Design a binder for this molecule. Sequence first.
Ligand SMILES: O=P(O)(O)O[C@H]1[C@H](OP(=O)(O)O)[C@@H](OP(=O)(O)O)[C@H](OP(=O)(O)O)[C@@H](OP(=O)(O)O)[C@H]1OP(=O)(O)O
Ligand SMILES: Nc1ncnc2c1ncn2[C@@H]1O[C@H](COP(=O)(O)OP(=O)(O)O)[C@@H](O)[C@H]1O
Ligand SMILES: [Pb+2]
Ligand SMILES: [Pb+2]
Ligand SMILES: [Zn+2]
Length: 420
Amino acid sequence: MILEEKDASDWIYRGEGGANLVLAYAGSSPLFVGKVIRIQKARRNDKSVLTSDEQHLWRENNELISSPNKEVLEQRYVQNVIIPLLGPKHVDAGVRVSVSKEFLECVDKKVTKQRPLWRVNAANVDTSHDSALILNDHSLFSQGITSGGDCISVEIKPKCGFLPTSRFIGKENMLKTSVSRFKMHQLLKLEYIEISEESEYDPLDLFSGSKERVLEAIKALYSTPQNNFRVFLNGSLILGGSGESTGRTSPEIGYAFEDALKGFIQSEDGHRTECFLQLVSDAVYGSGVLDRLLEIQKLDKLDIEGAIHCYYDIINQPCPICKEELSLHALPLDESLKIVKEYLIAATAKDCSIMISFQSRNAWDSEPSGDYVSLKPTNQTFDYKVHFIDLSLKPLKRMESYYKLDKKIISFYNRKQKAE
Ligand SMILES: O=P(O)(O)O[C@H]1[C@H](OP(=O)(O)O)[C@@H](OP(=O)(O)O)[C@H](OP(=O)(O)O)[C@@H](OP(=O)(O)O)[C@H]1OP(=O)(O)O
Ligand SMILES: Nc1ncnc2c1ncn2[C@@H]1O[C@H](COP(=O)(O)OP(=O)(O)O)[C@@H](O)[C@H]1O
Ligand SMILES: [Pb+2]
Ligand SMILES: [Pb+2]
Ligand SMILES: [Zn+2]
């Protein structure tokens, strides 16, 4: 009920986003076996729980606005906003837990060394929170170690899988119409020395509903995981960046990963990787869990270039974009809230990741799961579960920047295009 300083030694690095630092449990209180603990970071970058405007916007959802702390905020967002929309099956809201400041200071220091320096430069554990999330550790197949034996699990951060169709995209940005944001964004990150080569992954393939472009995408992901692909053997990273995007999959890494699957994917040395990929493909496509996610993403109906206007209507600032639509600004406040609301939900949808956890089917289940892929090649039936993670609520103020970022993206992509 309260994690104290001595508990710190029981949690071990697992990874981090920009916002939270996630530790896997290494101790043995039934309380925490198979759980991860998600700890909010204090960005020196960004500087109660909800702003004025935000209370307005999330008004529909009172449970949100009357939240004591940010931990409890996420929880309710996930529980009341996300779940009805994504289903409770594959989403879990987390269980709050009290933490002492010492514990957090303690954990922070204990893991510093395993964190990417740039992450550290950017934020630490926000030692002023009294709360933290305990989640199930989806890199292990099911909650209470009755282990159905080993578990390979794969995290994918799909990002956005569709092209805008909006009536509100500038004349110069019409390219957003053709080229996925992911692909356009690569060029910039590359420019900002945030990645070391363009990724081969195209979300359009992943979300395309085409079994075959889906496989294509999984292969991309494998080749250039950046921050989009990770693979855990029993809770241990065996492919992908640790709390950051990683580099192209060299032969050295490739080999390590190949080696890492022995026994789980039961094929000839050097063939487990292609089987595993195929396996991953079939679980994703067959589960059709993507479509549902996509539906949420598509709640960005008008595109930042659309939504951005509503933002300013909502925060009661004159619109900086229009200078000296006849259309969007004619919207009842009520209608505008909706649009901006759904935008931020779509935001969430766009940046979450799926984890799929694998396991050799087990002819002892008290109820035979309904999800399994059957690997032709190796004649192995795997059971899988899907879950969505990192379903954060996006700060309303962020609309300003969403706009500028997106503007930046499209302009730089246009510039590099003119290079003909
Ligand atoms: O630090 P990064 O590895 O680049 O990850 C960030 C981060 O996502 P996570 O922190 O959940 O990984 C941003 O979210 P914050 O954590 O900063 O709140 C998210 O920004 P939004 O979700 O607000 O859009 C952003 O994605 P994007 O570049 O689409 O803004 C994404 O960067 P990449 O996904 O591009 O790496
Ligand atoms: N429920 C979970 N089970 C296993 N690993 C997780 C879970 N949640 C997060 N992680 C690991 O921690 C990473 C970062 O946590 P995340 O929730 O993405 O924080 P942020 O959103 O701040 O980046 C995830 O990509 C994943 O590798
Ligand atoms: Pb994340
Ligand atoms: Pb996040
Ligand atoms: Zn406007």
